[PDB]
Structure 1
């Protein structure tokens, strides 16, 4: 019953041989779970180091001492490129999994991972690539963010084999190295960000089902702002239609929204974008419906001890029927989780309790939920004279103490956009660790964090372990 609310815990960790030797400055920069397996299949993720792609499958176990992580394919980039970015795709003919790997020479390598061969290379960027993402609407469409300050959109569909760059996000919207690229779930809006502290939202056209001699070039993003953060931005993503983004020296993940943006509206076209007619405007928006405001900061998840580190990435688990979980690892050996559904449940609990405090002038009894006891059996143990409020079990103390309320508000109060929401679970990592990337399995029972020293931390929830097996 309470299973819906369980957060992960450390289940397995491994260190991969140093492959950038110095003999400790190698890191895993990326991890991604394969997203095209049938429901129920063993989840399979790839962890890309600077020279290797380690592909693992995770299988839950009844033995605490057993190892759920087994490595099924291990690939080395036999060339001179050091890598830091990956994303998954599929063969358009055979439907075999394709792992894309990109790095500092400026090329995307596409690997046929089950057969251990190169599918192809995507050549054309003018500098190192730092992020890749696949379109959730078309598994053959990939976006790449580069030091060359552009995004390129690539297609692996057969009709584009001879020239696979279908779109270039160029122009003047960005002026220095891009570190992050993300697709909206509709496949048509793209977010980009990097060293110039700009977050840009771009609207993709539909791409012809046929050979394109040249890419469609896009010269203006539809939303642009350098004012949501005050530092370099290294991670950006959509959460539905809201934006999550992270910047260096700020120790926060920011949740915010573009005013007037809705993915239910028709996709605007390229001649609808705003152009920079005023050079003192650091925000501009096609979407804007006294002076408006083109964005609104909503909340800040507190992400302490990232220091001056950057290129550190969060990941939200967002799946129908399950709770949305935000996970991020900092630079001082900590991994953070927030279950976004606790926010609504806390606010219901506080409105129910503040209500009974007036309606019964204080004679109010608080009973935990997740018991055999319901707001009915609890009411029969008293009557009409005293109010019974149901408190979520995961709401634990320290009437309730000042310090108990302040500790609950610190984790679940959403009333201040400039506040800091403390992580709902904070797990410590042995030794000195800097997180680079987080990935979730399809069913959300596994969460993998990878970072420096070629380390992977594998968290699990809903395990099936039963009673030791040494």
Structure 2
């Protein structure tokens, strides 16, 4: 069961709300992250004018609808929106949905009671992305056309001046498209049209009124060299970095040399400064001249074309396989199970090992049957070498084509290779993905995009054989 990947289960189209009769899009989707373990998963999908809040419930009836819309909010102002994140009321613990758009304000909605909690005002241009700190649910970051990141606190002591930090200076020079928090809540990634990816270290913020935000002038790592185009999505994966740029058809996995979240957080006066204007990479963290970053792997996402503002999402929870999902600009959704890479490498090593110590006389048997590395050794005894193969390793002695298909999906030996998706699901009609979200227990994966369309994928389902 642990190796299962999702399949399409439900899809819906939400009425066009930017009328032109279907140029509306869902730009964001986010599952609520603060519910008790096991609670029915709830996500918000954000269109230009609406926040569509849905609960997903697993069903034994294959014809039933797992998706119920429990709240539908319209931004009754002039702003058109494209970014969302979840927070909580610090007094009441009620869910708060933050929504932001082309006027440069964050609206914070009390979604259960359907009213405005507050507005966060101060950005000088449209906001393109929002993220909540994993370490403090009252702390949120916004990325703007004004080229800055603003950090906000919803904590009651900051109510009169809720901007606690501005990431400014010269690190970014054009519209920002993506902002992301490290799990420790102290490192922030930002990126956008200037093709720069910056990593910033946040100070601790006093739990009292701050008359002015703290201003940070220098990122602790900065590079325009990982991509050759505008960067529209960045994230931490542990301490590693994932990012994608326009025109490249890849998601790049890479790392900052010397960066570890186990080390002490540097203070703002440890950051590097641009003393040499020909250097397009600089780093506080750096441990023959050393590279400051290493490209590790590239996930192949074909047919993104010239489209940008397309975001991927990793599912990363203790005890479950890490899954990367992303939808392209040509009606495909892609998944990679990152645990397959290690199992493939183990298998190929066991396979090569047995080819030597048995001169080529080796037998491969599928795992996940009644058969073991024992019951299979009893059938031929010490004369043969028996190697166990993962069931999801399917062919097409293995042929070259079979080995090449496997390497295309699971071989990690080339940093500028292209890793084929482990599952690739076709979408009906013309579709461009904007955002992906995962339910807390990973059984649901929701892709949203143009035509105000939501695609809802499921695994570990409960269906039991027609019900209509």
Work out whether the TM-score is over 0.5.
yes
The structural deviation recorded for 1:271 is 0.1
CA distance in 1 between partners of 2:396 and 2:439 (Å): 34
Partner of 2:37: 39
The structural deviation recorded for 1:384 is 0.7
Q: Which string of whole-angstrom CA distances, capped at 9 and with x for unpartnered residues, describes residues 113-133 of structure 1? A: 000000000000000000000
Q: Which string of whole-angstrom CA distances, capped at 9 and with x for unpartnered residues, describes residues 2-22 of structure 1? A: x00000000000000000000
Q: Which string of whole-angstrom CA distances, capped at 9 and with x for unpartnered residues, describes residues 94-128 of structure 1? A: 00000000000000000000000000000000000
The structural deviation recorded for 1:364 is 0.2
CA distance in 2 between partners of 1:5 and 1:393 (Å): 9
The structural deviation recorded for 1:155 is 0.1
CA distance in 2 between partners of 1:263 and 1:374 (Å): 40
CA distance in 1 between partners of 2:148 and 2:382 (Å): 67
CA distance in 1 between partners of 2:268 and 2:143 (Å): 20
Q: Which string of whole-angstrom CA distances, capped at 9 and with x for unpartnered residues, describes residues 247-305 of structure 1? A: 00000000000000000000000000000000000000000010000000000000000
Say which SS state the counterpart of residue 26 (structure 2) adopts. Answer: coil
Say which SS state the counterpart of residue 296 (structure 1) adopts. Answer: strand
CA distance in 2 between partners of 1:467 and 1:47 (Å): 30
Q: Which string of whole-angstrom CA distances, capped at 9 and with x for unpartnered residues, describes residues 159-194 of structure 1? A: 000000000000000000000000000000000000
The structural deviation recorded for 1:377 is 0.3
Partner of 1:131: 129
The residue correspondences of 1:15-414 to structure 2 (distance < 5 A) are: 15-414=13-412
Say which SS state the counterpart of residue 353 (structure 2) adopts. Answer: helix
> Which one of the candidate residues 455, 458, 464 is aligned to 1:460?
458
Q: Which string of whole-angstrom CA distances, capped at 9 and with x for unpartnered residues, describes residues 322-367 of structure 1? A: 0000000000000000000000000000000000000000000000
CA distance in 1 between partners of 2:2 and 2:359 (Å): 34
The structural deviation recorded for 1:86 is 0.1
Say which SS state the counterpart of residue 65 (structure 1) adopts. Answer: coil
The structural deviation recorded for 1:460 is 0.1
Q: Which string of whole-angstrom CA distances, capped at 9 and with x for unpartnered residues, describes residues 372-413 of structure 1? A: 100000000011111000000000000001000000000000
Say which SS state the counterpart of residue 349 (structure 1) adopts. Answer: helix
CA distance in 2 between partners of 1:409 and 1:64 (Å): 36
> How many residue pairs were aligned?
468
The structural deviation recorded for 1:318 is 0.1
Say which SS state the counterpart of residue 312 (structure 1) adopts. Answer: coil
Say which SS state the counterpart of residue 335 (structure 2) adopts. Answer: strand
CA distance in 2 between partners of 1:84 and 1:372 (Å): 51
CA distance in 2 between partners of 1:467 and 1:456 (Å): 25
The structural deviation recorded for 1:210 is 0.3
CA distance in 1 between partners of 2:334 and 2:305 (Å): 16
The structural deviation recorded for 1:40 is 0.3
Q: Which string of whole-angstrom CA distances, capped at 9 and with x for unpartnered residues, describes residues 225-245 of structure 1? A: 000000000000000000000
The structural deviation recorded for 1:220 is 0.0
CA distance in 2 between partners of 1:101 and 1:228 (Å): 30
CA distance in 1 between partners of 2:337 and 2:128 (Å): 29
Say which SS state the counterpart of residue 48 (structure 2) adopts. Answer: coil
The structural deviation recorded for 1:429 is 0.3
CA distance in 2 between partners of 1:360 and 1:152 (Å): 63
The structural deviation recorded for 1:417 is 0.1
The structural deviation recorded for 1:203 is 0.1
Say which SS state the counterpart of residue 376 (structure 2) adopts. Answer: helix
TM-score by length of 2: 1.00
CA distance in 1 between partners of 2:337 and 2:155 (Å): 38
RMSD (Å), alpha carbons:
0.2
Say which SS state the counterpart of residue 350 (structure 1) adopts. Answer: helix
Say which SS state the counterpart of residue 139 (structure 1) adopts. Answer: coil
CA distance in 2 between partners of 1:283 and 1:203 (Å): 17
CA distance in 2 between partners of 1:370 and 1:287 (Å): 45
Which runs of at least 4 in structure 1 moved beyond 6 Å after TM superposition?
Answer: none
The structural deviation recorded for 1:201 is 0.1
The structural deviation recorded for 1:425 is 0.2
CA distance in 2 between partners of 1:306 and 1:238 (Å): 22
CA distance in 1 between partners of 2:374 and 2:245 (Å): 48
CA distance in 2 between partners of 1:42 and 1:444 (Å): 12
Which residues of structure 2 form unaligned runs of 5+?
A: none
Say which SS state the counterpart of residue 274 (structure 1) adopts. Answer: coil
CA distance in 2 between partners of 1:139 and 1:376 (Å): 51
Say which SS state the counterpart of residue 407 (structure 2) adopts. Answer: helix
CA distance in 2 between partners of 1:467 and 1:19 (Å): 37
Say which SS state the counterpart of residue 384 (structure 1) adopts. Answer: helix
CA distance in 1 between partners of 2:450 and 2:321 (Å): 29
Say which SS state the counterpart of residue 29 (structure 1) adopts. Answer: strand
